[PDB]
Amino acid sequence: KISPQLLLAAHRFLATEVSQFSPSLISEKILLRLLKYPDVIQELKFDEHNKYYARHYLYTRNKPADYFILILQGKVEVEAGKENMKFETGAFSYYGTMALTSYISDFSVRALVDLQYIKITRQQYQNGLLASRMEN
């Protein structure tokens, strides 16, 4: 289970250091409502026997994805490139930011270790923006 300190810090960092989620674009109370919505936080269990599997890919190469994810915990790698280069990244690295706007994914995000991430859909994002336009 994710601790409240991690969730709140993810709210802070996500609000300030990410373009689409800035408090002017989406109000703070409604960002918390969007994070608190069910299925926004998802946990993945790593299978050691089958390291490469369809479940381990959070983003698949050249296939569509409509949502933005910010990784709170675990270790992950990105396989994207023309040469198929691979980089290792860790907690609080966000992927799929412009997929929220009105997306074939060139980047491949695969789970290296047990990770805990948040998934924010384009529908959730735009609807949350509309609710943010409500006085708040």
Q: What is the resolution of this structure in A?
A: 3.7
Method for structure elucidation:
X-ray
Integer Cα distance of 10 and 126 in angstroms: 20
Report the amino acid identity of residue 49: H
Residue whose C-alpha is closest to residue 58's, from 111, 112, 115, 14: 111
Contact predicate 97/74, CB 8 Å: no
Spatial neighbors of 100 by CB under 8 A, at least 6 apart, are 20, 67, 68, 120, 122, 125, 126
